[PDB]
């Protein structure tokens, strides 16, 4: 074997930054949608008392 490497992600030094940028973009998008979907505001008025 002689302890020889297999070139794990040659020139990683900028592609890992690229993956970071993509991941933070995905995080921003999914966070915004999760916030607006958890806390969607359907009105929920003028008939809610008939069902209570």
């Amino acid at each position: 074997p002689y302890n020889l490497a297999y070139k794990y992600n040659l020139e990683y030094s900028v592609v890992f930054n690229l993956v970071l940028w993509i991941m933070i973009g995905l995080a921003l998008a999914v966070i915004i949608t999760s916030y607006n979907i958890w806390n969607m505001d359907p009105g929920y008025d003028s008939i809610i008392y008939r069902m209570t």
Binding site: Y8, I37, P42, I47, R50, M51
Partner: protein, 150 residues
């Protein structure tokens, strides 16, 4: 030769196909229960009508079944990442597409079963509004099939 730990991506694809689909079905069932069990005190003759959105939401789980089994039977050790990564993407996509489907199904179902608690006619239209979201589920499973056979 192969990319490092490539088949793990496909395993996570099966898991992802499970996760967000489970979230969708669970969220649908949750607020369907809140709507139904609350409003069935004043006109519980609509229970046979209100059972429909439940199975309607479980359709998403049935979809996750085919996606998950298709991924699982196609998993192996020496993947070149060429097929495992596709399974990752497919499972993620279909799971959260089921999440959206169950989300919309639950809200429109709660609104429509509440509305039908006054007017029995609404049942038909309510069910149709659900059918639209299950067509979204159809879309998710279509692409899931594409990526499970690509």
């Amino acid at each position: 030769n192969n990319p490092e730990y490539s088949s793990f991506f496909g395993v996570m694809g099966a898991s992802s196909a499970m996760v967000f689909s489970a979230m969708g079905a669970a969220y649908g069932t949750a607020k369907s229960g809140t709507g139904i069990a609350a409003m069935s005190v004043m006109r519980p003759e609509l229970i046979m009508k209100s059972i429909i959105p439940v199975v309607m939401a479980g359709i998403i789980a049935i979809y996750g079944l085919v996606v998950a089994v298709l991924i699982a039977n196609s998993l192996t050790d020496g993947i070149t990442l060429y097929r495992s990564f596709l399974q990752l993407g497919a499972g993620l996509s279909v799971g959260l597409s089921g999440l959206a489907a169950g989300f919309a199904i639950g809200i429109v179902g709660d609104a429509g079963v509440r509305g039908t608690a006054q007017q029995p006619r609404l049942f038909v239209g309510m069910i149709l509004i659900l059918i639209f979201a299950e067509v979204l589920g159809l879309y998710g499973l279509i692409v899931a099939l594409i990526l499970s056979t690509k």
